[PDB]
């Protein structure tokens, strides 16, 4: 009961309204030909977008969003959600309201990647104490919205890293309004044993990401995608299967129906 979706790439809408536009067409209208059935969007700051406009297009192609992506606004305006500066941190937070905000008019989860921020030089102790008091009060400020914590490998960041490292934080948040996106690409660099870590995830799981080992499309590196869909029939995920790669090989095009052909195979003999 698994479903595809694939991670669109937009040009920035306050940079170039009609490149986001027609990026964001062009990518929802290859999605549908190639049979992903959502799709998922990064945005760095909704308040620039005419939502409505989007709404409209999702509805003409039967094309759910079923995901928002949050992490340019800490790669561009650097807003994080542990900022060592508490008026940076309240920004975060206002910020990460508004891609509720956009949620909500989709259903969409709202992705915890790199917003969540670094240790910039400090205790993890210290960096998870002020990640969970800026979760709780996105939970305190919203009715609806649902998150998921994205573990990333080292290189991106030294907080939150690991599958167990979410679990613990989710135990101390308590909400089920928060779960887990594992990501196939970071979980080969930092993950022990995938499959175990999926287990211990289990209904926490509430988004997946898939990319090969080098970040290509699924089926061109050498990530065992056999046994992570074993995995994941086995602790009953039915939820999205969301491709987030590089172009390669070949394009945008070519890596998302290379992806879409490698993942519908595993899931269809399972
Ligand atoms: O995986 C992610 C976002 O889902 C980060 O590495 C930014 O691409
Ligand atoms: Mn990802």
């Known amino acids: 009961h698994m479903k595809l979706s694939?991670?669109?790439?937009?040009?920035?809408?306050?940079?170039?309204?009609?490149?986001?536009?027609?990026?964001?067409?062009?990518?929802?209208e290859l999605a549908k030909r190639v049979g992903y059935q959502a799709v998922e969007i990064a945005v760095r700051d909704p308040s620039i977008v005419d939502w409505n406009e989007?709404?409209?297009?999702?509805?003409?192609?039967?094309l759910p969003i079923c995901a928002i992506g949050t992490?340019?606004?800490?790669?561009?305006?650097?807003?994080?959600?542990?900022?060592?500066n508490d008026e940076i941190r309240k920004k975060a937070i206002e910020r990460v309201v508004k891609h509720t905000?956009?949620?909500?008019?989709?259903?969409?989860?709202?992705?915890?990647?790199?917003?969540?921020?670094?240790?910039?030089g400090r205790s993890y102790e210290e960096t998870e104490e002020l990640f969970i008091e800026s979760m709780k009060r996105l939970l305190e400020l919203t009715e609806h919205a649902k998150?998921?914590?994205e573990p990333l490998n080292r290189y991106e960041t030294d907080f939150i890293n690991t599958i167990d490292d979410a679990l613990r934080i989710l135990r101390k948040?308590?909400?089920?309004?928060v779960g887990i996106?594992?990501?196939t690409f970071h979980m080969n660099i930092e993950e022990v044993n995938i499959p175990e870590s999926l287990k211990r995830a289990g209904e926490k799981l509430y988004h997946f990401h898939v990319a090969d080992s080098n970040r290509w499309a699924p089926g061109c590196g050498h990530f065992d995608f056999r046994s992570?869909?074993?995995?994941?029939?086995?602790?009953?995920?039915?939820?999205?299967?969301?491709?987030?790669?590089?172009?390669?090989?070949?394009?945008?095009?070519?890596?998302?129906?290379?992806?879409?052909?490698?993942?519908?195979?595993?899931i269809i003999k399972l």
Request: aromatic share 8%.
């Open 101 to 120: 905000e956009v949620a909500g008019m989709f259903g969409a989860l709202v992705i915890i990647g790199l917003v969540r921020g670094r240790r910039e």
């Open 54 to 62: 989007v709404k409209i297009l999702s509805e003409e192609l039967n």
């Open 173 to 177: 948040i308590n909400s089920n309004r």
């Open 228 to 266: 992570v869909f074993n995995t994941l029939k086995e602790i009953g995920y039915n939820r999205y299967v969301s491709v987030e790669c590089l172009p390669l090989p070949g394009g945008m095009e070519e890596a998302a129906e290379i992806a879409f052909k490698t993942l519908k195979e595993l």
């Open 147 to 149: 998150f998921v914590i």
């Open 6 to 28: 694939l991670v669109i790439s937009t040009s920035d809408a306050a940079f170039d309204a009609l490149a986001f536009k027609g990026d964001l067409r062009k990518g929802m």
């Open 181 to 183: 996106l594992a990501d």
């Open 71 to 84: 992490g340019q606004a800490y790669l561009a305006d650097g807003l994080s959600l542990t900022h060592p």
